[PDB]
Design a protein around this ligand. Structure first.
Ligand SMILES: CC(C)C[C@H](NC(=O)c1cc2ccccc2s1)C(=O)N1CCN(C(=O)[C@H](CO)NS(=O)(=O)c2ccc(Cl)cc2Cl)CC1
Lengths: 597, 57, 111, 64
């Protein structure tokens, strides 16, 4: 009419008398309700979305007049489809605003007049919290209604006489409504309950509309599908449900999981349909994602959902423990045949090719077994406790190469590879006896503590040599652990370095008699190192907390799955199958639970 | 045994690999011992009362 | 640069002004950096782990003064200021890694 | 007196109610005084926890 601000103020106030006649002025002035000057150049906001976000308790009756002007001006469809060109927002057509406002009164007329129900809200503000946004819902009006708790809006949009939003349609991320509805889910009570309810509603509706394929199958750009996405993101409330979903009516029962097999009074055989909790190495599986992935925040309970835990139990029973025990036997054997080939190292010096006699031939047999296992380990580490394992393999390879070169004092990284292989055998010791927490504590220790102690110890060595050179300098023939400066007494630090190491490495010392500063300084390092050590023991014991049960369960599962991934699982060693047709073959896992209902 | 059995040693002067290796066994045995003390103290839990009752019976 | 200027303490005894050569000039550079940081620390401590900090600053100042006086067996509070500055760096280690509780326990220990 | 809210007046030690509650160790009064919002505009200026905007289940509280 005259300027955009007055239009915005009028629509916010909701006055209709002033708007009257202005439409005639626009028509006579050759103006369109979608013209740029009517829309803010930054956000592209139009009068209609402004009214739709200024609801006076959901009774701003001006918007119908605006739509009337819109089709009168000749441009209505694009007027309803008013994408925001800014970066903070985007898309955000009238439908998103109306649906989000928890008001279906305007949504009905907005859709009926004709509004794109496939508008992509592809803006920064709509991305997940991590990717720079604030609210992620699926970038679609239907997924917006479902996520933002507007089931009535969903029912109207999916079954309106006008255009309907197909559920299978997926946003740029390839989500579909189910993926997004999983995304917003948390581990709370009300949110989880509502999300599972809407999930069941939406899945049933899609199945009824298209029984050929349930909506859950559709995979996203990352290729997860709702179940695996819930497993990866750390969801529990939605996860616990989606894995125990059963439906009554046969026409929509096929999409069930927790079938029923039979009952014998107080014993119930629930036939869980774990069709994607293990793929036998063929494809991605929910169990592998749940366990290997480190981003999981609720892995403890998620492992113990029920079918997963009993599936791991069964895997342990058949071809899960025999492999474990033969693995430890083989590894202890291949480490003993390395130990005995290390201590029996070829004699005489210069061992390029000293294998001559029967005992020496047996030593060669042991060495070749070690090298073969080393190269096999290399392949298993690159072809597929993994970095320490690559280190072991490369060290043994270097040792074998140097031995073939017959180079002196270089069969000493071979012994280091041996001792590594002896601390490398802690991979196995994570199952029986609930052992392996030594691995956790030493993992905490590593370089962190090693170089912390080493740097404080160099600190004290250097300060102490400084004390000697600054207090004692005022024929001598030099003292071994560093000495004053003149008389050609430069000496070296390393001697006092090892002296301080072993002396405060548990005594076995001479306590160099050069005093007040020096003795107080030695006392100070006593206190500091005692602190360091017992404090570190304090954190180690304070954590773990009796080694916990989640820990042992997790490493036990990891050992299982590593065992299965070792060999081709698709062979006749897979999880139990079930019913052929009608119910299914839909390989099923049968769990028996006794109840006194 | 005796040298890492609580000192009373001469520390055979043969170096880098050997000294790092001796340090490594220090760390490993200290772990073993204090970790074992950790399981022992973490269990029993002040010796419990069920225990004493059971052996008394 | 204080540790390396402590262990490389001027040789020959009687070090009033022994800075002569290139390596010794670099040692002088380190020592002057230490003294400058010490006086800056003094100002930041009086102009505004604070008492230990004033102790470090005053000890380094005393050490620099005695060195300028070239007095024997008195570049030994300088090494004490060095070791203090090495236990003085626990002010920082209270953030990442949730460390610094060593500071709390040693605070309980003290005298 | 809408010219100045009473909370501004400082004591001899110069604290004002919020800082005095913070210093003395109060929590119940402190948790409130820092999240105090008023409805009517004539007395809304003395509010702290304004409201900026909402996008459904996300609320941007504009603490003053
Ligand atoms: C084929 C399966 C029936 C058994 C398979 N193990 C082997 O084929 C062996 C090869 C050799 C060679 C010489 C001596 C002993 C063995 S055992 C197996 O079970 N897995 C293979 C994939 N895995 C791996 O690649 C990690 C790499 O980190 N294996 S490991 O670190 O080297 C290890 C650790 C403990 C034990 Cl106690 C045995 C092994 Cl190996 C683990 C799980």
């Amino acid at each position: 009419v005259f300027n955009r601000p007055i239009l915005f103020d009028i629509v916010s106030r909701g006055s209709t008398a002033d708007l009257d006649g202005l439409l005639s002025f626009l028509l006579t002035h050759k103006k369109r309700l979608t013209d740029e000057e009517f829309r803010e150049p930054s956000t592209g906001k139009t009068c209609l979305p402004k009214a739709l976000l200024n609801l006076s308790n959901g009774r701003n009756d001006t918007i119908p007049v605006l739509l009337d002007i819109a089709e009168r001006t000749g441009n209505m469809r694009e007027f309803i489809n008013s994408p925001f060109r800014d970066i903070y927002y985007r898309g955000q057509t009238s439908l998103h605003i109306a649906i989000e406002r928890r008001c279906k009164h305007y949504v009905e007329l907005l859709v009926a007049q004709g509004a794109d129900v496939h508008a992509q809200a592809r803006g920064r503000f709509f991305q997940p919290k991590d990717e720079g946004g604030y609210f992620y819902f699926g970038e679609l009006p239907l997924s917006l209604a479902a996520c933002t708790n507007q089931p009535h809006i969903v029912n109207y949009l999916t079954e309106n006489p006008h255009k309907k939003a197909d559920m299978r349609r997926q946003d740029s991320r390839g989500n579909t409504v189910l993926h997004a509805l999983v995304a917003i889910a948390d581990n709370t009570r009300e949110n989880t309950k509502f999300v599972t309810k809407m999930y069941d509603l939406l899945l049933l509706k899609c199945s009824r509309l298209f029984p050929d394929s349930n909506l859950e199958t559709v995979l996203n750009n990352d290729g997860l599908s709702p179940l695996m996405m819930a497993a990866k993101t750390g969801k529990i409330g939605v996860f616990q449900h989606i894995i125990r979903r059963e439906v009554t009516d046969e026409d929509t029962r096929h999409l069930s999981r927790k079938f029923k097999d039979w009952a014998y009074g107080p014993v119930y055989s629930s036939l869980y349909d774990l069709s994607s909790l293990d793929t036998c190495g063929e494809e991605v599986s929910v169990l592998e994602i749940l366990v290997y992935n480190s981003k999981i925040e609720n892995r403890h309970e998620m492992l113990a959902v029920e079918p997963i835990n009993e599936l791991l139990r069964d895997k342990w029973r058949k071809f899960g423990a025999v492999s474990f025990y033969i693995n430890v036997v083989s590894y202890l054997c291949a480490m003993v045949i390395f130990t005995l080939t290390a201590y029996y190292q070829p004699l005489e010096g210069t061992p390029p090719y000293p294998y001559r006699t029967t005992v020496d031939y047996l030593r060669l047999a042991g060495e070749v077994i070690t090298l073969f296992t080393g190269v096999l380990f290399f392949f298993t580490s690159i072809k597929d406790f993994q970095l320490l394992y690559f280190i072991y393999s490369v060290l043994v390879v270097v040792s074998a190469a140097l031995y073939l070169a017959g180079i002196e004092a270089y069969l000493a990284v071979m012994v280091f590879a041996l001792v590594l292989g002896w601390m490398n055998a802690l991979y196995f010791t994570r199952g029986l006896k609930l052992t392996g927490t030594y691995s956790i504590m030493i993992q905490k220790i590593l370089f962190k503590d090693l170089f912390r102690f080493l740097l404080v110890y160099l600190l004290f060595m250097i300060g102490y040599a400084s004390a000697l050179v600054t207090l004692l300098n005022p024929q001598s023939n030099c003292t071994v652990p560093t000495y004053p400066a003149c008389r050609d007494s430069e000496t070296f630090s390393a001697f006092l370095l090892d002296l301080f190491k072993l002396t405060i490495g548990m005594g076995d010392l001479e306590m160099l008699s050069s005093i007040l500063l020096l003795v107080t300084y030695i006392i100070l390092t006593f206190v500091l190192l005692l602190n360091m050590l017992i404090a570190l023991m304090g954190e180690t014991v304070g954590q773990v907390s009796k080694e916990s049960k989640h820990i042992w369960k997790l490493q036990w599962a990891t050992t299982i799955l590593d065992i299965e991934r070792s060999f081709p699982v698709f062979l006749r060693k897979a999880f139990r199958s079930g019913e052929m047709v009608t119910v299914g073959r839909r390989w099923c896992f049968r769990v028996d639970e006794v109840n006194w209902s």
